[PDB]
Amino acid sequence: MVLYFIGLGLYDERDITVKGLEIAKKCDYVFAEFYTSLMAGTTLGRIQKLIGKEIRVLSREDVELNFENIVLPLAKENDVAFLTPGDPLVATTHAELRIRAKRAGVESYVIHAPSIYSAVGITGLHIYKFGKSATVAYPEGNWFPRSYYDVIKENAERGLHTLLFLDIKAEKRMYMTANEAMELLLKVEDMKKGGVFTDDTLVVVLARAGSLNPTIRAGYVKDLIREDFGDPPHILIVPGKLHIVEAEYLVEIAGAPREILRVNV
Amino acid sequence: MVLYFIGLGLYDERDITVKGLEIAKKCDYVFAEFYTSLMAGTTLGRIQKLIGKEIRVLSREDVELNFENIVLPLAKENDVAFLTPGDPLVATTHAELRIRAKRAGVESYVIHAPSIYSAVGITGLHIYKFGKSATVAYPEGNWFPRSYYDVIKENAERGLHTLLFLDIKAEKRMYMTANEAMELLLKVEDMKKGGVFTDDTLVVVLARAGSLNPTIRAGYVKDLIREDFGDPPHILIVPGKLHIVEAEYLVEIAGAPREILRVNV
Ligand SMILES: Nc1ncnc2c1ncn2[C@@H]1O[C@H](CSCC[C@H](N)C(=O)O)[C@@H](O)[C@H]1O
Numbered sequence: 378m379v380l381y382f383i384g385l386g387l388y389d390e391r392d393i394t395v396k397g398l399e400i401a402k403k404c405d406y407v408f409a410e411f412y413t414s415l416m417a418g419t420t421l422g423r424i425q426k427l428i429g430k431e432i433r434v435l436s437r438e439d440v441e442l443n444f445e446n447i448v449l450p451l452a453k454e455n456d457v458a459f460l461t462p463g464d465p466l467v468a469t470t471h472a473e474l475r476i477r478a479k480r481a482g483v484e485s486y487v488i489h490a491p492s493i494y495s496a497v498g499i500t501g502l503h504i505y506k507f508g509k510s511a512t513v514a515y516p517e518g519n520w521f522p523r524s525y526y527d528v529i530k531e532n533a534e535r536g537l538h539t540l541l542f543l544d545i546k547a548e549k550r551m552y553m554t555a556n557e558a559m560e561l562l563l564k565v566e567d568m569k570k571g572g573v574f575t576d577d578t579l580v581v582v583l584a585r586a587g588s589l590n591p592t593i594r595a596g597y598v599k600d601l602i603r604e605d606f607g608d609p610p611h612i613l614i615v616p617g618k619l620h621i622v623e624a625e626y627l628v629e630i631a632g633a634p635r636e637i638l639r640v641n642v
Numbered sequence: 643m644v645l646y647f648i649g650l651g652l653y654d655e656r657d658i659t660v661k662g663l664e665i666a667k668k669c670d671y672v673f674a675e676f677y678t679s680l681m682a683g684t685t686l687g688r689i690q691k692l693i694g695k696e697i698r699v700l701s702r703e704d705v706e707l708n709f710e711n712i713v714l715p716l717a718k719e720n721d722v723a724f725l726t727p728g729d730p731l732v733a734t735t736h737a738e739l740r741i742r743a744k745r746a747g748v749e750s751y752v753i754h755a756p757s758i759y760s761a762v763g764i765t766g767l768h769i770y771k772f773g774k775s776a777t778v779a780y781p782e783g784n785w786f787p788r789s790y791y792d793v794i795k796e797n798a799e800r801g802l803h804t805l806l807f808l809d810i811k812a813e814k815r816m817y818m819t820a821n822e823a824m825e826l827l828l829k830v831e832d833m834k835k836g837g838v839f840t841d842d843t844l845v846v847v848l849a850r851a852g853s854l855n856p857t858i859r860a861g862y863v864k865d866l867i868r869e870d871f872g873d874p875p876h877i878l879i880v881p882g883k884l885h886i887v888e889a890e891y892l893v894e895i896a897g898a899p900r901e902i903l904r905v906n907v
Contacts, residue, residue: 384756386659386754387754389661391659391660391661391664392659392660392661392754393659393660394651394656394657394658394659394660394755394756395655395656395657395658395659395660395663395692396654396656396657398660399656427660464756464760464761464763465763465764466763466764466766467760467763467769469768469769469770471763472763472766472887472891473887473890473891475891475894475895476890476891476894476895479894479895486854486855487764489651489652489657489756489760489761489764489851489852490659490756491649491659491729491754491755491756491757491760492756492757492760492763492769494759494760494769495729495732495754495756495757495759495760496729496754498729498730498731498732498737498757499731499737499752499754501737501738501740504731504732504733504759504775505733505774505775505776505777505807506774507774507775508773508774508802509770509771509772509773509800509802510769510770510772511770512770531800535774535796537773537774586754587661587754589751589753622735622737622738625738625741626737626738626740626741629740629741629744630740630741630744
């Protein structure tokens with residue numbers, strides 16, 4: 378009669394919370410989805426071994442078209458877990474699943490875990506200064522999504538930072554790199570010419586948040602566009618004007634050039 | 643010979659990540675602060691039992707004024723951990739402590755934990771639609787801060803949601819309720835008359851996120867201002883224009899008036 382939405386956290390199998398792991402271990406059935414994102418620092422086998430029970434992975438279609446026929450039936454007479462990368466319901470499509478549970482007469486509870494949305498605090502940027510967020514998707518065919526450019530523009534003009542989630546082709550395990558995102562943004566700049574993203578734009582890259590050794594780097598696009606930030610996942614942030622403490626953290630912890638202290642503050 | 647910043651999570655001792663727990667268990671010295679937020683579902687004793695270590699609690703002054711004198715000295719010869727409610731670097735100024743650690747020749751690492759900043763996803767509001775965040779501070783003496791009002795105005799005018807962290811005075815055990823926040827905002831509205839926060843404004847309240855049964859309520863200020871949302875901590879959210887799916891979740895899960903379903907496109 379109960380369905381638990383359990384977050385797996387940021388990077389590896391130990392990023393789940395103690396609460397999430399203990400609840401999952403007591404569930405009769407464990408399902409999971411790995412399409413809103415992936416857990417780059419681990420494998421399905423390692424997560425399965427930690428929990429101690431077999432995990433039934435659902436595809437995007439399984440969830441969107443058949444969640445109520447795959448997961449909910451068992452949740453009616455058993456305790457069922459539905460694992461998701463990060464924090465449940467940060468991904469926009471998760472929320473509606475709680476309504477489906479209600480419709481099926483199934484109780485649902487959410488077990489939170491770290492999300493990249495909040496983990497960016499490790500960049501040293503003040504969380505309150507983050508404005509609207511956006512995702513940079515891989516162009517495909519004649520589709521070159523670029524609304525994120527206006528998101529950066531609108532946030533920056535109000536002195537706010539912009540968090541850019543980078544695309545991940547989950548089934549192919551293809552992660553968009555900060556380099557690829559910067560290249561796309563420069564192309565969009567060529568088309569819009571709003572002076573929003575250029576070689577002189579200060580950006581912050583966070584790779585493998587959750588790891589004990591994530592890569593945290595800050596600097597100008599001209600210098601970072603071809604830099605190796607290591608294995609995935611990557612996110613990119615275009616900060617707005619900086620508080621001196623934010624800049625000092627970027628310089629001392631993220632290796633930002635001293636120039637940001639007199640250009641971006 | 644290192645320092646670990648470890649988040650404890652939203653509500654109780656089990657909100658710590660498995661990664662954080664296993665690292666804390668092996669540290670030689672453990673410090674913590676409980677003034678940045680309130681973990682309503684646990685006690686210092688329960689946390690100490692889980693980690694199997696004695697925890698030295700520090701005050702705001704101990705940290706902001708003497709962190710490098712109380713904590714770093716030990717971190718130079720042993721593995722030390724500094725625990726905090728929620729995520730250690732969200733809506734705190736603890737990131738700056740990593741700069742102090744570096745200057746003292748101490749390597750530091752960060753272990754994330756679920757944060758209220760991302761937990762708001764449980765309200766059904768799209769995370770990417772949240773704009774700048776603000777804090778509703780307690781008026782004191784002859785002062786009455788109102789900056790948070792302008793944050794709501796700025797976000798709302800561009801269709802973004804506003805997350806309002808509520809004040810806390812741990813030493814005096816004062817935790818601002820969503821009710822008090824609403825009362826304060828109505829008083830600011832009477833002064834600025836910007837039509838930003840009135841009796842007809844739709845708001846969302848999230849209380850005790852992280853617990854299995856948090857209070858999630860949505861409705862007009864006039865109806866919720868005197869409603870009992872349970873024990874603290876609370877957070878207040880003033881949504882911008884809603885997407886139909888956001889409204890549906892607020893109605894089905896947060897008990898919002900069905901009239902909000904009729905979104906004014
Ligand atoms: N579990 C919880 N439920 C509701 N509000 C919470 C909360 N935890 C924190 N808050 C809100 O956030 C304020 C503390 S701000 C510090 C936040 C913390 N670093 C984190 O990552 O969550 C509180 O005064 C309250 O308004």
